[PDB]
Design a protein around this ligand. Sequence first.
Ligand SMILES: NC(=O)c1ccnc(-c2csc(N)n2)c1
Ligand SMILES: [Zn+2]
Ligand SMILES: [Zn+2]
Length: 341
Amino acid sequence: NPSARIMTFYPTMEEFRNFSRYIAYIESQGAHRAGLAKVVPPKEWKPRASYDDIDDLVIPAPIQQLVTGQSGLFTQYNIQKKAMTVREFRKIANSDKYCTPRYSEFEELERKYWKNLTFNPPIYGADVNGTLYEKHVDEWNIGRLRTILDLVEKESGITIEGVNTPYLYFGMWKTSFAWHTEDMDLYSINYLHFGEPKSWYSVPPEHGKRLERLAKGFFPGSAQSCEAFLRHKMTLISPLMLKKYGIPFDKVTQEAGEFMITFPYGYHAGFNHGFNCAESTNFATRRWIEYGKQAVLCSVKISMDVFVRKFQPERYKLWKAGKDNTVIDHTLPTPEAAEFL
Ligand SMILES: NC(=O)c1ccnc(-c2csc(N)n2)c1
Ligand SMILES: [Zn+2]
Ligand SMILES: [Zn+2]
């Protein structure tokens, strides 16, 4: 994938059963170069019988998303509102004030989003601790992915809500996620349970330092105050701004019943088309360890010691001494992808 374009995968039921194996396979295809990949699950697979019984589910901390800015460069502020139910949230989402506008092509809706994001602030029902998967679902269960991340909970006992536990995201028209990479530059999985689509923007990991240099130059105040200020997740930058400053990027629309995989150091942002529900968590592969070791944090921290000892014992002394000069190649697939190479 020399173009570093977002790829789409269609695994069969047998191919879908082994999660960590299918991620290794997609890396063997170059999926990781874009920093974002779509996975369309088998038609026979379903994580829940119906979604008609979640009206009474409580969103404890909804946020009114206040956006300030101009010329494709914005700052998002979150105002915590009183706790509301899925019924109360859906009612606001489909109301005349907050409902999705009329559109023919995605391009029209994208223009409507970037033209009106500063007006009529929407409410995001984000960071809800929970899952919508039924107990018996073994295939791609966000709550129990069984990757090497499990070492943090198995060996330390430490729980990081959203990172090694699932999070539910109730979106409406114009709700968004600002430019960011994952905590500790981890991978992420996003399943759109139901509702209107979710559009995504991505910067290939190999061009990730360019977005940072751009972001730094625009917000010199925020950059002097924090080493990794984009981790605050308040910075919105339009595709036109990225096109203007020569930042390579791609776009994709996630429809209900689809998965999105974000890769280590893959910068992403996007917005919700209307009333929807997405389930999210972080995971890892042997390849991620170098990123975790090199990750520039906000001045969430996972101890890398357990990983370095178990998977890089030869490098353990060198890394503790600070003499580990390893330079990351973003084009390289995870060692687990050796069987497909
Ligand atoms: N709102 C979303 O659907 C969404 C999509 C992608 N990433 C995140 C996210 C938030 S905080 C983090 N590390 N990732 C949230
Ligand atoms: Zn994310
Ligand atoms: Zn900071």
